[PDB]
């Protein structure tokens, strides 16, 4: 009843959750036309199926969403019981309001075409922005790497009983409030107004920087910086998802971190190779497990505070 | 061409508007059966006509919602040529996400209704958040009172120049250091563990406390006692929706406000009588110049 | 795969089809805020399963349909199978046409909110009009409290084989001749000009007024009268929707009712105190019956004409 | 501006409303395939115009409507800036509830066929159910033959101060006590157990029979009979929609009806040339008037 | 789980398809009133089954729409957990396009119809357009008679192996080039500009002339003569679709046709007691066979080559 | 009123648009984020305009599909009165149908997004199929480069009064018919077994291939070559939309043709200097005057 798909062939996340489930990814004949335009075809029945497509981990954000589409809509029409998209990190999710500009909000887009290609259910983590799973009618599971992130913590910072968990920006009090309370320490808040200023203390602790992501590392480094001359005495920072596209891995290398860590909710290894700073949390069994308890009707909020 | 309604019996601020327009409110014979079911019967032709109704405050927020959409759904059968949800504060607001609870995201539920009810456009001010837009298919202006309250703070605070504006929680990060930015000077946040913590420095100079909204005042009253524990000279509390019910008026004269700022988006002369240190935000202009605007085409964002 | 919610706190009703299907009414965190805006939390998952929220018979129709909707979404957006909305009761039901007058249709109004909120199914009894199932683009099932009348009225009413059933009104003359026929009795009809007209013979005849519902009493009461008038012998009410507001208990105790007969779709407990004329037919089988049926796959329509 | 084009056939109300608008008819080749497929090309551009379709009365209902919708579906496509159905029968109007019945309710299909079709607005007559205006999302506005039935009665009977308007069925029981109450007479009703069983009074006075519509006239036939027996003076029968199919034409002769009077909503030519106690209401000035309104932007509510 | 409707009383096709299920048709009350308007009663419930509705053959298209719309609707209201549209021959399926004229996709309007009729899924044969699988957003099935008239071809035409496949149009190009590339042969084809112009080598070969559908056979007639005057030995015709109205049969009996091919997607049996040159594939078992893997959630898709 | 927008970087045809109109481009911030994210941001006001967004041409087809969603729904959501998506080449056209596969038909899941985004309305050039107007419900002008096509046959090659039209394919049949029938010559057809095989006489005449699109060539080229060995005088090819991505400029000039003749729906100037045998057909006067139409209520049409 359960079919497992992927995108493109940045096929190493969906492989590593077919594993887990004790399956073999789905035949797809998935080529790039000479003008760029994505043919593809499923190579097996997927009539009365139980459907989960997880997006290909390829830079490329419009090719990887078109993908996608083009694969939900060609099991829709396929006669597949259910369809679920699988987004590790849903795109244009930083788009999410006009910020008092004449601006598109990109992320209700993207939504909108996942339900007109004919999405039943989409299975996510840590949204940028919470209020996206309200840019659907459909259910949306967002899942959390907080508790992959605290496990993290406890087993690699032996300070951690006296660290601050540090927000790069305002918007992200909320989560490192959160973060804070559970491991009982403190938070700090960095603030760029072309300066940052640091709200907290960090004075001798560790600093952790946490983060929903990190792209071109630009804010993190600074921020890196600043708890450093607060008097912190080591900075980690902590991204769910790293993009790190451009200079990223510039910065990183030649920035004061002991240690960058990130999710494999993309994919990491080119990366790494020139950036040995970076650490992989694998996240693999949360969205094995999500698929898991979707398909069985059991309790995916499990594991918002457990790690399977 | 251009027709204003009001909801049940808040009429001050629907007035207010009607008035800046140059226009009276449309006829509405609108009640409540000895059952609590909504009447309503527009007591004119809106057909062809561009019609904006703004939303009542009986205060009771799933009467004044289901009176809002009754009249939304008459006037589009009624053949109006398009229909304007004018909703100072957003019903529902603050459930815009599950919050990792089994929860509605009752906004977009809110959002929905409005727009199966057949609204083409919604006028509203200060959304709890900013992605509540994106509930909507449909276009939505998000009016400021930001650039009134910067106004009152200069206008009414000799020692701004050196002050610290305060958020109430960690969500109101965001709002707190776009006003604190735009004055030049200092934030700070106070936050839950229970115990209240603060992060900022707010020593020996004036903290204005800033929120979207309060509801019974508690998180705002035990965060004016806290700024001041930590010596702040005098604590203010501005806040754009001022819903003040239950022990909220009690609490606000029990706590050490200098004042408490609100908007007229939700009707505060019963609670001025009752509350002396609150002070109000007449917001009926920026409401009428988004209609008139909207209504003839010219850019909205001027008023931001 | 059965999960059954309650709206409220006027839980009678809901624990009474609870009890008859064998379950417990599921979790639900129902309170409501300082500015009066209701907050839900549903208390156990309700993935898969094939919900029903059973609509509150609190008096308050805007508080009660919102907290339904509510509901209602709530558990479609954490994946419910299915989930119908039992509303014994329709709110607006009475506004369900023009009337000649700039009016809403409330009732569709009402319809597109339980349908936008993510009702897949609707259980009602006695639509004020039948056609209100065309509201929707869902399946209804419109239940009566006929065969229950029909059985009241033979056990109850000793001359049932000779009396008139009367129609208060001009649109309750289908549904008062559906049940004269089935009696094999006569039928007779009130219209209200600021005077009622009664057209068909009730002389020396127990007189039964039949109607859907009555809200403040005034047009049963003096219907009543004028059967009297008229000649019958005694007047019974019967009502499926006893809504009873405003001055309608100091009506009934003062009008010349033998007795006035309601349904349980609205909690009546605390109007029989105050009202000795008023008896009440339990319903709670017929709907618990339903939603077994519903649930399983067989025939509701066995209801429409059988008390289960 | 307004655009005014007819379905298949039936040019002849069509034509009265062109007529009394000052326009000449839209030009469309209409047609039947050999294998009774509807074929329909707009002859001229409808780009940016408010255009009205008027349904064809060809008498076979699902002819008629597929028409309707492909006519609808084409003015669409071709950009028209707005299409209203103008549709003085709707069809499958009956056919609005279940009965209790495992049935379509396919007045509700109808009203979601022209709403797929691209209908913006619907004009219709004498809704056989008021409710079917809730079948649409799209306004609806039901024009009412009442006034205009109302006048031929007191300018055609007599004796009509002191007759009594009767009803054919339970359902029509509304329409009649209506009907009675203006005049400021009496109503009585006819059920069938079969025997027909009547309640009310027409001993020695005028009966009027009042139905919105009559198709085989069965009903219509046999209560006019039982009216006799009870003692009417005249029996006359009144339908806004009058289809008279089969036997119809026959047993209104083969009966007592003094007249029987029905709207021209429906082709009534052929059939009055066959039956001499048929007497027409010409109600195209009532839907001309609603469609030069409705482009207006002026009151319909008038006309009721 | 599994329930067959027919329309109207053309039941032959419905009678063998449930035939080959081992299922008797479902009851339906289904009459036209004496103002032409279709009243339909489902006599059972169908209340969580998975219901088929097969189009009738009577050859009035908007009663025969008409009637499966309304049909669908019922059982839709009636809670059918699916209602499948079984349509051997799409109406309107001609008018799939504009063709440079103010003209309405009648088609697009006739999926539209469907669609908000309810129907879940369709089921078809050999759409006019493929196109058309495009104008809805539910899954079709597109079978084709091809299978079928492959083995056809192979066992009652000698000379299979040195015939010309020949396309009555232009439209037709990309069907009989596929045929003829199965069968290893030519292909021809015949433009008609008042005068009909043909490609391709037919001298001493035998031709088959296939298309999708012939309605009056003024082209299929026509081309009979060309193809002779080209030297072709003997001509056949295969449609799938064999509407033959007007004069039709007429022309049959007096064109050049060796014989005349359709399939019963259409009811030939009237048809063919005054056209002797008329032969008839069953498309029942491909029919039965779609019904039986739509319910099973097996592949439909080896139907596609294969004739069961 | 009406304003005109482009895509990203392609800015010719947009550009030559906005002249023969006499208007200059709307202001907009088009960009990329380091992680290819697409940035817009409508610099102006759009409220009550009529909007008409011109897709660009930076050959990437899912990144160009992207931003003019974006730029869609940006406009809807800043209140345009109407939103038009002007798209020469409409993207995954030739994916319109299963083809016996379990394939997506694309082509409608664009006309679903292009839908889902706001859009009110498409104008398009030579559609790889027709029928892709059905998958919209929204009205499509869908304009032909035929008589363009025509014009430039008859002033450019000399012996064309017998000349024959050829299809590289199968399904390219309806399209050189046409062709051919409007000149009053002669077409051939070439289907791929693989071998080719040629039906139709070319025999000592002009051979003048013509597809709505060529991507690689291949076909085309290989197409050429056959016609040649079939004694073809010279060979022409006519395509509507060029892609010529890959090897494809190379594999023109390898080949025999006199000439290669497209439009600039899409960018040429890049490929025109690598090859010398391709010749362009402008049409931004055929879309311009498609949407100065659409702006006035005036006849598309007439341009077919």
Redesign the interface.
Known sequence: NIKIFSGSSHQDLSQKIADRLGLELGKVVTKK?????????????????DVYIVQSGC?????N??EL???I??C????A?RVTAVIPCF??A????????????????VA??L????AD?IITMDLH???????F?I????L?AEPAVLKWIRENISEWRNCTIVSPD??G??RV?SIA?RLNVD???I?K?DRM?L??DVKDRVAILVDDMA??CGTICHAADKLLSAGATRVYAILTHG?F???AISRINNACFEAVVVTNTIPQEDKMKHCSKIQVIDISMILAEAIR??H??????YL?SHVP
Request: charged share 25%.
């Open positions: 036309f000479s003008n760029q335009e994505t043919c593809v075809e499923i190579g097996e029945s997927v009539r009365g199926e830079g490329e954000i419009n090719d969403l078109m589409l083009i694969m809509n060609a829709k029409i396929a006669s019981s795109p244009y930083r788009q999410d309001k006009k910020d008092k500009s004449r601006a598109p909000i990109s992320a209700k887009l909108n075409t339900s007109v290609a004919g259910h922005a919470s209020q996206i799973q309200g840019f009618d259910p949306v599971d967002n959390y305002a918007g009090a909320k409030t309370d938070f700090a808040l603030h107004e200023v709200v907290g792209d071109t993009i596209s451009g200079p308890r979707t069985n009707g059991e309790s995916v909020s918002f």
